[PDB]
Amino acid sequence: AHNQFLKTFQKERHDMKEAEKDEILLMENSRRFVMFPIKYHEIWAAYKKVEASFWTAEEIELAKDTEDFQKLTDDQKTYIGNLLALSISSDNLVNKYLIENFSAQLQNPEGKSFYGFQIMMENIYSEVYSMMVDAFFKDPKNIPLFKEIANLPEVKHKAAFIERWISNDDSLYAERLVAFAAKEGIFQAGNYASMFWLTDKKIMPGLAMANRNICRDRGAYTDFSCLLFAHLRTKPNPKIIEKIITEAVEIEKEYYSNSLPVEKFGMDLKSIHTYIEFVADGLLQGFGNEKYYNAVNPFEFMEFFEKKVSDYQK
Template identity: 40%
Template sequence: MIENVHWEVYSLLIDSFIRDPEERHQLFHAFLAMPAVRRKAEWALHWIKSNRSFATRIVAFAAVEGIFFSGSFATIFWLKKRGLMPGLTFSNELISRDEALHTQFACYVYSILKNQLKDDELRSVVIEASEVEQLFWRNALQFPILGMNADSMVQYIKFVTDRLLVELGSDQFYFATNPYDFVEMISLEGKMNFFEKRVSDYAKAYVGRSGDTEHIFTTEADF
């Protein structure tokens, strides 16, 4: 599963950046040591194990993918804006696209369901997830950094929540604006440059191999 790839990438990054074994252990077990992280995990697990309707669970899944990761992606894009940690920020760009696809997929599946939720039920699930995420960032950003603080992050979470509600066929709840224009700009730049970078990287492996018949496609090979 692609989520396993994401976890492996983040695990390797923690191993690379965090040298202190005790701090590393704490990060790997954050859902046990940090109440705000544990609350997010418990919320997600509650809906995974729930016997509620499929429509309810797919909305909860969309909220996990579309809201719970958004603030973390924004903080890493904050690093990219300042030209810091290119390995971390590039891998984060790729992972953020995967999570965006997961969110879009959940919204699409919900849109084709015959038995959808009443609007107030849908909004209740999404807004509850948003409140959990807002609480997390109130704890995580107790000390502001340049261009980012708890208030602006909460505003961003509200903006993302409104966008998800609209994608699920409902109306905005917070009517919030995006305080982090760099998130949208970096995302756009990534889409423009991603394929150029990948093509360039792939091409390097074949430099000087013109005339090599080993990789010519044929339907006559023996199996």
């Protein structure tokens, strides 16, 4: 099964565990909390970075945002409700647990300093969701999908991905790190694409903000998993790097063809299908891996000086 693939590398992934001991990033030493005089500049750079963007639930004003809602189709309506629930009970949850695991794995303070920020926010995002559910659904009862999540091809197929690549005894840091990057960046690439499209221009402001933010932050987060990935000596055969993102890509889509609409919501599915591919490649690259899908951005998207600066460094 999943092993048959990993069996194909029982010689370059053996040398890896055997080398993990010498992976100083995991060289569990004293530094539990950030003694100052910092050595890891980047890892810290990133902490301060996301730290700058801090925000609260109060930053989300829900009313005059309830309007545009009750004045819509009957599904975009339920689409949202499923969206706002596939989170508050699915992702947001496993989300917080995972961050502690990885945080624990990371032996450098400055690092667990970033993670320490992240969880705090995942807690704060949770409230934004329980803010929109009350906002335009009055009660936890009023949501359909909110009861048989555990029994959704997609959520089920998702969990297997984590238990398969992360929470698994037979795993390697670099690997779990990749997937985790996959889980944060790829999984839910639609949700954003969706709400983006929607809110875009003259629809439900608060929601547009929440999504603008959340999506942002989660972008930094994923970055961290890379910023960490780039520190490891013995990297995962590019092959393995692929399957991971590959697997995530496919699992991601399923949600829009099964659980949540995108068809009934109001868009040309084949596009979301492609965008997901987009994200993944850019992510494939960010781990020292050649593009796969070779997709092309289907929607005018936003997540200059620097980019054009380095573009002329290459």
